[PDB]
Design a protein around this ligand. Structure first.
Ligand code: HEM
Ligand code: HEM
Ligand code: HEM
Ligand code: HEM
Lengths: 141, 146, 141, 146
């Protein structure tokens, strides 16, 4: 649902992330592949070693797909409408993995913004990624 | 819990510089705030109306303080997380009735508190290591559900 | 999201349930309390013995809250808008329990309609309860 | 797996009148149909375009046939579900990489197939009994993830 107070914290926290967005977008991926080994069965044609310019490049896709959400928050089911078919229809990505990611994505932000990662923004972020995850899985519902 | 020597050090080195008092309430606190339904088990603690009230309620920083203990405890008994938690498993299950899916939520909010308190020192491999531990712990308490 | 083909199976399967709706609505509850003991921590002031006229009475609430969804399917977030505050705000019902129920609700229907519980309607029903569960938890998002 | 004598009989009596051949594919089939992403592991089976193609693919009613075996097997070794599944746990984990959350989905779709095939005979208490078994099984295969 996301409330105006939530919108403000997401737009607030994402702003303070800015420039490093892509960087951060590839740090969450590595954390995932490492902590949740089972999520690699999707990136074979990928190099998942610490330096993969493929992971760095992908982190930019995810990061900007998210920045695409924060800016159009009131309307994700349409902006993301497309990434919905690809993850659900073509890829068949298990819904659990959207939880494993979102976690690593909150474990990344806290390790870069120890000032504004207040219990509140933390909750706001968790709701935001919760809404993104829902929309990308929606094509299953 | 396997913890290869690499991992064994990552978890020890870090865990050793942890503010065992403050860090404990930091987690419990954020749990009730980020997963509201969980407040349904700590209504005897006080005002949990706003996050500020939760992040200050003395009942909370005292319970989180005891929670963190069981960890340092289990963390010093990896070879047997089942035996050590036998007592707490009977408590949280046949008495409190918390669902095992909520022990995973707490283990992760903890990983987020450690990521926040140690920022960069908290490298991916250090996480993938703690994630294993948390998981191993979330399976002991859930043990009595069989 | 629910597709026209889905709508048809939900409206189809629910029609064939009709009159017994309330009955069925109390058989899923008992199945839950039995199979998932942990879900009772919500009904203390309730009698959960095999005959409880309290469980029978509640099964009518749930059953008709659902019939309220199938008829207004294209608009659940508004019809159910109310049951959203009560389950999320006042009650604080853990989201996992909405999964435990929905399951027992599909294990009930199959034991009463062995003709139309085709792999397809089964999938359609699972998507429908998946959408109801999402809306009642939405007040958390 | 505890299974009190009451439960022990419910699971045996029922399980004995089960079409061990057909029931096995009935589940696997509905899994790929109701939880599409799971088809991601059986692409070598054939056309899984429609449910009709899935509910007929001979590769499926042959695999589900082997799945049901492991059950009758585990069901005859409740006192030790860990030992019996050691092999299959290494297979589904360090080779197939299926997530343990999908062993719960299969155990439940199974409970729905049994509820469908035995209708009323499938009383609530009979379910709460099988649910325990399924759960116990879903924890053995997931065992190697530690
Ligand atoms: C927060 C949720 C996520 C977002 C925002 C996201 C976003 C994206 C975007 C924008 C693309 C790339 C489109 C392109 O460059 O052509 C993509 C592709 C893909 N995503 Fe995700 N994704 C997310 C989660 C997941 C998860 C959880 C998995 C798997 C565990 C996954 C698996 C993939 C795969 C397989 C591709 C294709 C990449 C390739 O093989 O080249 N995604 N995703
Ligand atoms: C990581 C897993 C967890 C650990 C290590 C843990 C540990 C503990 C400990 C040590 C106690 C008190 C023991 C004593 O007073 O001597 C306790 C009590 C309790 N736990 Fe947990 N717990 C865990 C997760 C949870 C979760 C997820 C909830 C759910 C909200 C929860 C709810 C309770 C409640 C309500 C009590 C308070 C009981 C009282 O008033 O004494 N715990 N827990
Ligand atoms: C398919 C989802 C469900 C539906 C459609 C549903 C629907 C309803 C409705 C219509 C009411 C009654 C309003 C009234 O009579 O005043 C209600 C109340 C309630 N529901 Fe649910 N419910 C569902 C799932 C759950 C779950 C999963 C739980 C707990 C495990 C739960 C716990 C309650 C409680 C505590 C009440 C108040 C009953 C009382 O204490 O008197 N509900 N629900
Ligand atoms: C209730 C738990 C399950 C049981 C009892 C079970 C049992 C089995 C057995 C007995 C085999 C083959 C052994 C042999 O060929 O000798 C097998 C293979 C396999 N299982 Fe499972 N399984 C379970 C759940 C799952 C789930 C949830 C998936 C996920 C889609 C899955 C995916 C696989 C795959 C892909 C194979 C086929 C491997 C091959 O081609 O031989 N299984 N399983």
């Amino acid at each position: 649902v996301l409330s105006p107070a939530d919108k403000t914290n997401v737009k607030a926290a994402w702003g303070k992330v800015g420039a490093h967005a892509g960087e951060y977008g590839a740090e969450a991926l590595e954390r995932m592949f490492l902590s949740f080994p089972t999520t690699k069965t999707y990136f074979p044609h990928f190099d998942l070693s610490h330096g993969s310019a493929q992971v760095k490049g992908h982190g930019k896709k995810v990061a900007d797909a998210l920045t695409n959400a924060v800016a159009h928050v009131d309307d994700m089911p349409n902006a993301l409408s497309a990434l919905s078919d690809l993850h659900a229809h073509k890829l068949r990505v298990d819904p659990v993995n959207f939880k494993l990611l979102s976690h690593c994505l909150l474990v990344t932000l806290a390790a870069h913004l120890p000032a504004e990662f207040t219990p509140a923004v933390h909750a706001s972020l968790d709701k935001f990624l919760a809404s993104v995850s829902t929309v990308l899985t929606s094509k299953y519902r | 819990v396997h913890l290869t020597p690499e991992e064994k050090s990552a978890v020890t080195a870090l865990w050793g510089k942890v503010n065992v008092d403050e860090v404990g309430g930091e987690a419990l606190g954020r749990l009730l705030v980020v997963y509201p339904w969980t407040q349904r088990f700590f209504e005897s603690f006080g005002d949990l109306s706003t996050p500020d009230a939760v992040m200050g309620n003395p009942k909370v920083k005292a319970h989180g303080k005891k929670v963190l203990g069981a960890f340092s405890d289990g963390l010093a008994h990896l070879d047997n997380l089942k035996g050590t938690f036998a007592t707490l498993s009977e408590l949280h299950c046949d008495k409190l009735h918390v669902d095992p899916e909520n022990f995973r939520l707490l283990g992760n909010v903890l990983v987020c508190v450690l990521a926040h308190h140690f920022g960069k020192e908290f490298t991916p491999p250090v996480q993938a290591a703690y994630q294993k531990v948390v998981a191993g712990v979330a399976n002991a308490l859930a043990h009595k559900y069989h």
